[PDB]
Each structure stands twice: as C-alpha cells, then as structure tokens.
Amino acid sequence: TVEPNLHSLITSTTHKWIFVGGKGGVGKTTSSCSIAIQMALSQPNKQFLLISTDPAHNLSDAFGEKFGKDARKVTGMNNLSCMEIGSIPGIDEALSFMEVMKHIKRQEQGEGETFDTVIFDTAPTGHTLRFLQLPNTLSKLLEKFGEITNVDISGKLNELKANVETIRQQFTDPDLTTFVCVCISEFLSLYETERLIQELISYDMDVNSIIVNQLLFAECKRCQARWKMQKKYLDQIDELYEDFHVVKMPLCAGEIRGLNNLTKFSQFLNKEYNPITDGKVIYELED
C-alpha cells in the first residue's frame, strides 16, 4: 500500500527530468502544469522549466499568458519558467530531442540563470520515446558491418549510443527521471494508457505514477449513473496497481486556467483531494 499523491515526488531533489503524457484528451496538459507548479513552490531555490511540443501552444493557452521560443519565467513566480516550441526508426525522434538539449542549454547559458528540474508534456501524439532501444538493434548490425569491413556510418551510430548512454545512464536511473502519466476512467483510456506503460518498460524506464482525472464523486441521475462508469473503473486500476502512485483526482466545473485557478488546484496533487472535506475549495474555480 503506497501513496496517492505526488508529494513524494513534488520534492525529489535528484529528478532533473520528468515525463508526462497520456494518449487522450484525458488532460495531461494541465497535468504537465499542476506538477511543474507544486515543485517550484516547494523547492523555490530551484529554477524549474516546463515545455511542450504540442504544436497547439496549449500551455500558454492553459495559462491565459503567452509563451514561446525561449524560456520565460512564469508571471507570478521566480523559479518556474515555461517554453513552447535516414528512414530508420528512433532516428527522427532522438534528434528531435537532441537539438532540444542544445536549444535548451543555450537558454540557460545565454540566460545566465540555470534550471534545476525539467518537466515534459509529451506531444498529444504521445512520445518520440521510441529511440531508447536504438543502440541495441543497432548493436547486431554494427558487428555485421564490422565483419565485412574487417567510417561515417559507424561514426553516427557510436555517437547516438554514446549520447543515449550518457542521457540514458542519467535517464535510465529512476532518480533524475521518471514518468507520470495521466488518464481517466474509461475503456479507451485504460487500455490505451496501460499500453503506454508497456512501451515505457519496453524502454526500461522507471515509471511510478498514475493520475486519474475528471472523476466524479456523486455522493443528477446520469451523473451518479455515469459515476458508476468511473467507479467500475477506478477499482480496475487500484487492484492492479497496489505498488503504484495511483492518484485519484476530482473534477472542477469547466475551464480552469489562470495561474491563480491552477495553483489552488494542484494542491490536490499533494493532499490528494477529499470530496467530503476539501469539497468547498472546488466550486471555487467553477465560475
């Protein structure tokens, strides 16, 4: 029996890389936020950074405040920045990333002030993740090419492996990096979400958290009805995730943005909201 929250993580000190996603309009965008909020608050001596590849420019949107090609400290804080931006597999995916690295380090160096923990918003298209396996399936044929030659193709391949190992070693340590995913109480979520997890493990990636969202708590007819949906489901999860941060989360009516509204939300990423108690605070962002 483990914890429902991400408190435990809101305060990691060795996490310089967090990946958030959730195939669906399950809402993980706000996720990507309500997390990169709880962190700075409770580690303000940490310049943090939350960015997205979702072309949609959802972040700012979800923020009622515009962001772009370069790191911009949130308006309201002083430690939480935000930044919107060969036929083989994995390829593109990596580079995609890769360039990011550099494009990011520019932004800390050329900035001066540097970032501590970095928070991702895997494209609604999921993750370019693919590429971890990269240097493996590339290990077999590296030796094939070797046996025959016994220079540029070898070069690139070794570089990729290198990079991935360096990124991978830091990356394939559950302590600087790990992977929360958002997903709600419905067949297509579950399954699909579940799927997510597999590919991740398939990348040997630590991953310990689940954010279920837009729950109900009807304690109107179709409401309570609908409610049962979710419930038939919540459990499903609970049962098969004992060892998980399966974090139930409630659903405040309609739009919810404005750093104001947002912060006062994310609190429940800590003290996992309780309907009965914390039920007052809810209708607060429902106006």
Partner: peptide, 30 residues
C-alpha cells in the same frame, strides 16, 4: 530507507510483469 522500498515495489511490479504475462493479463482484461 523509505525510498528503496519504492524501488522494491517497482521491481515487484516488474516481476509481476515478467512473471505476470502482459499478453495474458491483457487477454483477461480485454
């Protein structure tokens, strides 16, 4: 060592996954 415990839980999940049979788990869930 509260942290470690978390690692063990993750690992236990992996054993369950390696042990569990994702293909089989998927079949029952379906």
């Amino acid at each position: 060592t509260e942290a470690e415990k978390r690692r063990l839980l993750r690992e236990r999940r992996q054993k369950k996954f390696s042990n569990g049979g994702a293909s089989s788990r998927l079949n029952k869930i379906t």
